[PDB]
DNA sequence: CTGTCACACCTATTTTAAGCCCTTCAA
DNA sequence: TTGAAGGGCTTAAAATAGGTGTGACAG
């Protein structure tokens, strides 16, 4: 008996190794979409318009890609940053691409007594309203962290694959309902 | 034997003595600080974290004995950043594997309400503003329990709820002479800081009492407002359990649910991306500076 | 009294949630 | 006076990494 609610993917974090050392001053000077403030942060901040994402490019050749709404979009965006870096004169490669984190969200559309949930599911729950309005639920199977709000809105994070977000939500729904 | 541990254990004891805690609390808090220091993650932490850890260990001890110490009050006494206190507290509870009891609202109502200097007349507290301490505590507690039953406490800071409830209890005990006094003027004469969310909590509590008033025919006919409802608070609290059940029976929800009109759902676009599509040279070239753009930038940095 | 060692943990990127808390501005 | 509105923080995840805080080791 499924809930009939499908969590929406909000953000994907992926990594890739461009397999060569990079001169960040050269990238900042010769790219249009690069932001570089070494005294503030040691990496280049690069942005492309489609898929709309942000990349962090390190002098080691390692790269982090953020903001995509699908694992496919994250891969296409990562390949585009690699192609920008290649055109800038570097012998960049596309090695060890990996989805590292996925964030999902949904609404159960009924209020939640967080003060009651933290008592019945204490071993997984942390609720400190002097610090944060949501209850932090650390699910073991799958290993997902959920942020549960009084509104019934739920944030799911820490997933490596899409199925882990869906599995964690189907697990929490009967706990929240009854 | 560590110099920062010795300093920490001494600070733990000094905090307990300043707080005038029962004698047993000191030992328990000292043992938590020692337990904390055995973990490598705490041993290698910044001296600022080791300073707020003093407060975390005393707060955990107070929470287990229902002693109503707030995180805000500890940080004020320790001259500590609340955010550093927040991250250290969450870390040490998780690290020591503790099931820390929640803040005891009933005991906070007693301690916080008693600090309101309204029990004796003075140049700043006129005769008509002086109230009985027992009458004050009893009505404040009933208004805090109402706020808790009507979803005004869940996910919020608890102290501004008690500030709003103490003010409303005080006004409702002599409505004819106290309705001209605002929340800000009240906290100033009672000599208590005004918490920023306390005005929002007040307006929510007045709207809840107005929905309850709709359940009594003789009050529904008066077409009450947030000002005229105050003289009937005594009457509404007399039947709070019954009026709350009747209001839910006929939509009573957390304020963040009713409602969010400014929301956009058409922003997400349909996705047909495979991640394997060709990437043309023209698609990439638009992200490159031209030779002129490079020269103009270089000259401007020289 | 230094060097090594193994942690912490600042800067930053993304995204949702609800609350807080500040500046800014309006009749 | 008293609010609304808007910006920027709190919480969770995850990788990327230099510089440096912090204390217990060997030598
Ligand atoms: Mg983090």
Author numbering:
A (entry chain B): 157 to 334
B (entry chain A): 65 to 314, 356 to 407
Show me the paper's own sentences about this structure:
TFIIB-related factor 2 (Brf2) is a member of the family of TFIIB-like core transcription factors. Brf2 recruits RNA polymerase (Pol) III to type III gene-external promoters, including the U6 spliceosomal RNA and selenocysteine tRNA genes. We have solved crystal structures of a human Brf2-TBP complex bound to natural promoters, obtaining a detailed view of the molecular interactions occurring at Brf2-dependent Pol III promoters and highlighting the general structural and functional conservation of human Pol II and Pol III pre-initiation complexes. Surprisingly, our structural and functional studies unravel a Brf2 redox-sensing module capable of specifically regulating Pol III transcriptional output in living cells.
We obtained X-ray crystallographic structures of Brf2-TBP complexes bound to the U6 snRNA (copy number 2, U6-2), RPPH1, and TRNAU1 promoters at resolutions of 1.9 Å, 2.2 Å, and 2.7 Å, respectively. Where not stated otherwise, we focus on the analysis of the complex solved at the highest resolution, the Brf2-TBP/U6-2 complex (hereafter referred to as the Brf2-TBP/DNA complex), but the conclusions apply to all three complexes. The overall architecture of the Brf2-TBP/DNA complex is reminiscent of the TFIIB-TBP/DNA complex (Nikolov et al., 1995, Tsai and Sigler, 2000), thus providing experimental support to the proposed common architectural organization of TFIIB-related factors and TFIIB. Brf2 contacts extensively the phosphate backbone of the DNA and establishes sequence-specific contacts with both the upstream and downstream TATA flanking regions. The highly conserved dyad K113 and K114 contacts the phosphate backbone of the DNA on opposite sides, allowing the insertion of a short helix into the minor groove and the consequent direct recognition of bases A+3 and G′+4 (numbering is relative to the edge of the TATA box, with the non-template strand designated by a prime). The side chain of R110 forms a direct hydrogen bond with A+3 and a water-mediated hydrogen bond with G′+4, whereas the main chain carbonyl oxygen of A108 forms a direct hydrogen bond with G′+4. These interactions locally distort the DNA, leaving the base T′+3 unstacked at its downstream edge. Brf2 residue Y260 establishes a hydrogen bond and a T-shaped π-π interaction with nucleobase C−4 and an additional T-shaped π-π interaction with nucleobase C−3. A Brf2-specific short structured element (residues 357–363), the “molecular pin,” encompasses a conserved LPPC motif and lies at the ternary interface between the Brf2 C-terminal cyclin repeat, TBP, and the DNA. At the tip of the molecular pin, the Brf2 residue C361 is buried in the groove between two adjacent phosphate groups of the DNA backbone, establishing both van der Waals and water-mediated hydrogen bonds at the upstream edge of the TATA box.
